[PDB]
């Protein structure tokens, strides 16, 4: 019927708008930050996808954890995450953020940033190439394109 057709099209429009302008704030904790700046360098030009460089936390759509999260730093990262407006997404970059990495068996390192915040995309590597991080960002865009909020509301 038209009732579900209208919400389907409106959901498609909202998803397109949300994913075609992703504004990230980056936690440049360690040397994965160098590769994310290489993703904003001229060769890859993340801005050309609508993904602005260094958005503020209060107008950020996605958080990129790029580096090792230590026990001393975990509360600050959770505090920053809470501040972000919803809908918010988290991309985990590199071994250190994914699962602790080369400091997994350490007394001062959080064994994966997903103990602290939920994670949408895990980008592997030490460090991932800027091209691999771009692949992860585009995968997050496809994941956003897959979501369907208005249908769930209409069918509930």
């Amino acid at each position: 019927s038209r009732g579900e057709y209208v919400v389907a099209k409106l959901d498609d429009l909202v998803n397109w708008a949300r994913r075609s302008s992703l504004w990230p704030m980056t936690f440049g904790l360690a040397c994965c930050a160098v590769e994310m700046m290489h993703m904003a360098a001229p060769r890859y030009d993340m801005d050309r996808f609508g993904v602005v460089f260094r958005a503020s936390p209060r107008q950020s759509d996605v958080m990129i954890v790029a580096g090792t999260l230590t026990n001393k730093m975990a509360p600050a990262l959770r505090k920053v995450y809470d501040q972000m407006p919803e809908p918010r997404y988290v991309v985990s970059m590199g071994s250190c953020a994914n699962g602790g990495g080369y400091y997994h068996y350490s007394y001062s390192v959080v064994r994966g940033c997903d103990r602290i915040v939920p994670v949408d995309i895990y980008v592997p590597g030490c460090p991932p190439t800027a091209e691999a991080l771009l692949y992860g960002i585009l995968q997050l865009q496809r994941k956003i394109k897959r979501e369907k909020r208005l249908r769930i509301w209409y069918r509930r």
Binding site: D82, E86, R149, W153
Partner: protein
Amino acid sequence: MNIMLTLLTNVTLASLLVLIAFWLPQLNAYSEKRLPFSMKFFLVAITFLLFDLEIALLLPLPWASQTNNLKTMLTMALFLLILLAASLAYEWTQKGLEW
């Protein structure tokens, strides 16, 4: 009437757009979870106020130039500008423009 209608339209449009911005994302359910008082800022504000008063005195100059008393107008106009300069120089030399 034209100017009043123009301002009314501008204000109405701004209010409508701000309110729809503030209410479109409020309809969907979500989680829904000192002393210092720098004196320099006050002094720069006061300096602006005084220079603004002297600019207010300066404002009628475009009409002042058709008077048949050109010499007196030039003297007085120049005197005001000179007067304005003295305030700037006195404030400068008394360490009034520092941080």
